[PDB]
Amino acid sequence: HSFLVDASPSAKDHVAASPKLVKLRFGGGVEPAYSSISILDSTGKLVVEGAKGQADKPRELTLDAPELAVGSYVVKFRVLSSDGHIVEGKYEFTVDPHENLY
Numbered sequence: 001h002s003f004l005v006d007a008s009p010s011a012k013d014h015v016a017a018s019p020k021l022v023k024l025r026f027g028g029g030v031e032p033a034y035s036s037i038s039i040l041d042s043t044g045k046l047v048v049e050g051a052k053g054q055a056d057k058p059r060e061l062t063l064d065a066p067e068l069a070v071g072s073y074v075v076k077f078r079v080l081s082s083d084g085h086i087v088e089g090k091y092e093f094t095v096d097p098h099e100n101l102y
């Protein structure tokens with residue numbers, strides 16, 4: 001099992017602006033073409049799903065995010081580990097305002 005070992009943003013982080021991407025790092029290889037990352041908004045609506053990786057960094061995945069409105073989000077993931085085992089997980093982060101919102 002390739003468990004999550006690091007993330008950006010990570011669980012319970014507040015970020016000052018919308019993240020350009022979500023970056024996940026696992027404890028073993030994952031297969032990007034058979035892995036999924038999703039961002040959910042604070043109502044649980046699907047904002048974006050996907051996953052990309054680079055062959056020389058088998059333990060990492062990224063997801064390009066659209067511009068995220070201020071508020072809380074959940075990142076969920078469901079990855080296929082290189083040892084053949086599926087891993088799911090999820091965590092929350094918050095986009096704080098960095099200026100007044102109109």
Ligand SMILES: [Cl-]
Nearest residue numbers: 028029058059
């Ligand atoms: Cl590895």
Ligand SMILES: [Cu+2]
Nearest residue numbers: 001002083085
């Ligand atoms: Cu395993």
